[PDB]
């Protein structure tokens, strides 16, 4: 019967280990100390502290039923850290989702000297929000019938924390969730059209390259070549790899050269450079596909990391708020399966370090280096 603690403990090790490798990666690797990682490091801290302080002590309550091994003063303290590190983990993940969106539709303010300050005030707000939501628990302690901790269960009663579980769950989960849902459908939409603005502009670049290869006057070659300059300069905007955008710079440079010959009246000299453009295109055809190939791929991973979020915290926060409202429901049948949904919210702290690092090559090369010492 104590065997279940086996697998429960195999969930604690990755949480401690996984989140500790992220901290060791950002603080020791000189090539990983950019702004957006200082904020991801904070998510690992919360996920680490919840696997190092919350998750281990929560393991004792399953073994020592109706008992509290630690001093009774530390029961309201342990509960304070359960909500704190959890709300922080959720809001960090929420603040990541919104940045993943703004970082796509507008790569503005990409400087390393000024994007690091925004991360420092982005990280502090999350920790202040998480505190403000978890702060009332230690203030108004839990009421117990006994003084000795060996005869009590450390748990928040429905009566003493009724309006807190309701107004606290919204500010911690359903508020950032509402943001994460809209930022998701706006992100999948942000790369649905940009993946389409690249093709239609890429085909506008062909049709004009087809017509100037078949011309008789000097007006058609400069009408189609101007339509290329705009189309080529817009397709550059629809990319997230500077060398593919460098390919458009080379191309546009050749557009201006050939467009300069067209105004001098030399038709057959302009087409000499138009055939050179057809060569510039063939060099970046491969990288044009790997751009859309990486677009349809990034779209699905964003659906999984988002699906796993609602897959793990919903069963708890839905069951939690249900136990506060529904009186017809069997009170003992809800908190019997709620024990399960608590650990599902805990395991999220172990997947977060994985679904945000293993999809990157520089992290893998650095993890195996300290595993290797």
């Amino acid at each position, epitope marked *: 019967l104590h065997w279940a603690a086996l697998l429960i403990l195999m969930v604690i090790i990755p949480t401690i280990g996984g989140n500790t490798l992220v901290i060791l990666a950002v603080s020791l690797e000189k090539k990983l100390q950019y702004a957006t990682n200082y904020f991801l490091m904070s998510l690992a801290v919360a996920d680490l502290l919840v696997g190092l302080f919350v998750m281990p002590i929560a393991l004792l309550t399953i073994m020592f039923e109706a008992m509290w091994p630690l001093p*009774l003063v530390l029961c*309201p303290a342990w509960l304070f850290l359960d909500v704190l590190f959890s709300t922080a983990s959720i809001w960090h993940l929420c603040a990541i989702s919104v940045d993943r969106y703004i970082a796509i539709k507008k790569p503005i303010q990409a400087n390393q000297y000024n994007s690091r300050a925004t991360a420092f005030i982005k990280i502090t707000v999350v920790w202040l929000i998480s505190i403000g939501i978890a702060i009332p628990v230690p203030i108004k302690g839990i*009421e*117990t019938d006994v003084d000795n901790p060996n005869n009590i269960t450390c748990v928040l009663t429905k009566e003493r924390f009724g309006d807190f579980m309701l107004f606290g769950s919204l500010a911690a989960f359903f508020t950032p969730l509402a943001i994460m849902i809209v930022t998701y459908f706006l992100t999948i939409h942000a790369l649905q059209k940009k993946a389409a603005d690249l093709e239609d502009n890429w085909e506008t670049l062909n049709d004009n390259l087809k017509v100037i290869e078949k011309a008789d006057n000097a007006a058609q070659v400069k009408d189609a070549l101007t339509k290329m300059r705009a189309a080529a300069l817009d397709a550059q905007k629809a990319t997230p790899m500077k060398d593919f955008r460098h390919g458009f710079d080379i191309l546009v440079g050749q557009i201006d050269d050939a467009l300069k010959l067209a105004n001098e009246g030399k038709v057959k000299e302009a087409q000499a450079a138009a055939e050179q453009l057809k060569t510039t295109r063939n060099a970046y055809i491969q990288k044009y596909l790997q751009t859309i190939s990486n677009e349809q791929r990034a779209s699905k991973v964003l659906g999984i990391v988002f699906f796993l979020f609602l897959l793990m915290w919903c069963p708890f926060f839905i069951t939690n708020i249900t136990l506060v409202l529904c009186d017809s429901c069997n009170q003992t049948t809800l908190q019997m399966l709620l024990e399960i949904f608590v650990w599902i919210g805990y395991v999220s702290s172990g997947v977060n370090p994985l679904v945000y690092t293993l999809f990157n090559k520089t992290f893998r090369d650095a993890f195996g280096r300290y595993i290797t010492c």
Partner: antibody, heavy 127, light 107 residues
Framework: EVQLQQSGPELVKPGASVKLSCKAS????????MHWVKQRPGQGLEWIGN????????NYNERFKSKATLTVDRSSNTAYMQLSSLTSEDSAVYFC????????????????????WGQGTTLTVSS | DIVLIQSPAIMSASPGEKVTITCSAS?????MHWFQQKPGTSPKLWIY???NLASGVPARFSGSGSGTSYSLTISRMEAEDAATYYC?????????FGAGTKLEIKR
């Protein structure tokens, strides 16, 4: 206004089951635990056990563990207690009472006195 | 378990003369409560915590106690407070009570 109305005195044959009720009034019933106390004159007071109405969790004394069974009913807002295999030594007066709760913060622990006892129930066992 | 031994089982004191009920414990206990039961009525708590009086209790009562041995002292003996006195333990389970101490007025 806090009033705990209990069942009436009863004579029950030995070996039969007893069902004592304890009605609550004046408060939400679910805020505090519901303790039970048996008083045999001359020997003093003995603690039977308590129960928590919300979750239905029950705790018994090591002696009265197999004898008494504590239950509640949120619909009728009463606290029951079933004594099975009634012997002759189980003839006493039984009370239902709520006791204060200790409120424990990281700073210190407070205790508030809300102890309110209910009317006794004289139980007698004889043929 | 944690039995509570309170001596004397019965005592008689005249008005003015003063009383000190002792309630000694089997183990070291955090706090100690006190109850007064007048025959024909249910017991009502008189001193919650080691030294704090309940609601409606006269100021002549004064409870003091250490860890093992606790006590209940009064200030001015009057006929209204003649009853049995039990002390109980709320530190740990099972909750234990004292045997009782009956007070007789000497008139």
């Amino acid at each position: 206004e806090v009033q705990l109305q209990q069942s009436g005195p009863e004579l029950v044959k030995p070996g039969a089951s007893v069902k004592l009720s304890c009605k609550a009034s004046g408060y939400t019933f679910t805020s505090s635990w519901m303790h039970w106390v048996k008083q045999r004159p001359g020997q003093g007071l003995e603690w039977i056990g308590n129960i928590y109405p919300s979750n239905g969790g029950t705790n018994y004394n090591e002696r009265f563990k197999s004898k008494a069974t504590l239950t509640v009913d949120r619909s009728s807002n009463t606290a029951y207690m079933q004594l099975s295999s009634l012997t002759s030594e189980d003839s006493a007066v039984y009370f239902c009472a709520r006791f204060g709760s200790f409120i424990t913060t990281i700073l210190t622990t407070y205790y508030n006195p809300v102890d309110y006892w209910g009317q006794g129930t004289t139980l007698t066992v004889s043929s | 378990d944690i039995v509570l031994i309170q001596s004397p089982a019965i005592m008689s004191a005249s008005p003015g003369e003063k009383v000190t009920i002792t309630c000694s414990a089997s183990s070291s206990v955090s706090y100690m409560h006190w109850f007064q039961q007048k025959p024909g009525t249910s017991p009502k708590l008189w001193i919650y915590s080691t030294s704090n009086l309940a609601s409606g209790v006269p100021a002549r009562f004064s409870g003091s106690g250490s860890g093992t041995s606790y006590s209940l002292t009064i200030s001015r003996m009057e006929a209204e407070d003649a009853a049995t006195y039990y002390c109980q333990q709320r530190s740990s389970y099972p909750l234990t009570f004292g045997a009782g101490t009956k007070l007789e007025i000497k008139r």
